[PDB]
């Protein structure tokens, strides 16, 4: 089953699988696709076409083949896809057994 997680900019995300399971990322986006999510100043929530597909790769590297993963959604990991638009991290993933 696919699990979904979301964390606003500067806040941390923790993807977690029960017991000894492996995290397998299926989707990951750091940017903006909705104006009513992750409150901010109205003008900082304008762009709705802010997408960063590199997040899929970055998330997979930092989380795949692990039991739990954690990433702060910010300038520490991802760069600035839509400068001036408060971004958010949306990661979908499924828990699978080891080899």
């Amino acid at each position, epitope marked *: 089953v696919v699990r979904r997680e979301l964390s606003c900019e*500067s*806040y941390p995300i923790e993807l977690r699988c029960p017991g000894t399971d492996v995290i397998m990322i299926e989707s990951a986006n750091y940017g903006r696709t909705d104006d009513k999510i992750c*409150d*901010s*100043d*109205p*003008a900082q929530m304008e762009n709705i076409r802010c997408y960063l597909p590199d997040a899929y790769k970055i998330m997979s590297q930092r989380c795949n083949n692990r039991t739990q993963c954690a990433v702060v959604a910010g300038p520490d990991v991802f760069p600035d896809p839509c400068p*001036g638009t*408060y971004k958010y991290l949306e990661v979908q993933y499924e828990c699978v057994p080891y080899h």
Partner: antibody
Amino acid sequence: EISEVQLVESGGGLVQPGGSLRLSCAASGFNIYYSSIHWVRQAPGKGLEWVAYISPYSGSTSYADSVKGRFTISADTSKNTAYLQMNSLRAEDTAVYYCARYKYGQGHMGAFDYWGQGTLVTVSS
Amino acid sequence: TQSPSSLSASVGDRVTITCRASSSAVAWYQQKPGKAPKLLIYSASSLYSGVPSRFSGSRSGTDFTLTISSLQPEDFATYYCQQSNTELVTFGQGTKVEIKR
């Protein structure tokens, strides 16, 4: 040594009409960059009056028509501290000034969930 | 900037205050003399952490309201509303809730 969200204000004191004063709102436990800093004042026995804000994220600023031209708000994110420079002070500016924060990412859409202790500015000759 | 409006009330009463200052961005605050204000309700209807359940907010058109279901002794103070008017913030005039005797 344990962290906590707190807004500590400094810079208050006595000024003479036409003079100037600098108020400072130092932030602990969160980053001003991910917040909008507002100054709100209250004269003795009166209501709350918002004066000015700054959102270091986009650095846009807004000022109350009563303070526009005499008051300038700014922020230094490397010091996690917002400032309110008040020039050409007049008697009607006498009031306790409180700095407040709107933390992004919590649903508040403008709410102020942490205020400073407040500092008093008395503008009189 | 005006001085707070007065509302004489008794323990057990129900007070429904309406906001006049201009978004869905209404927030309500309680202040007692000599202390900084405290957030009660944000985003029209959301109860802030640690605030008693008796406090509530609602929206009916341009009519945003703060309602205390049952007045308790420490609820007697001044209450302010806030509205995000584009690039401007506007507090209401204030309601000081005083006791009847």
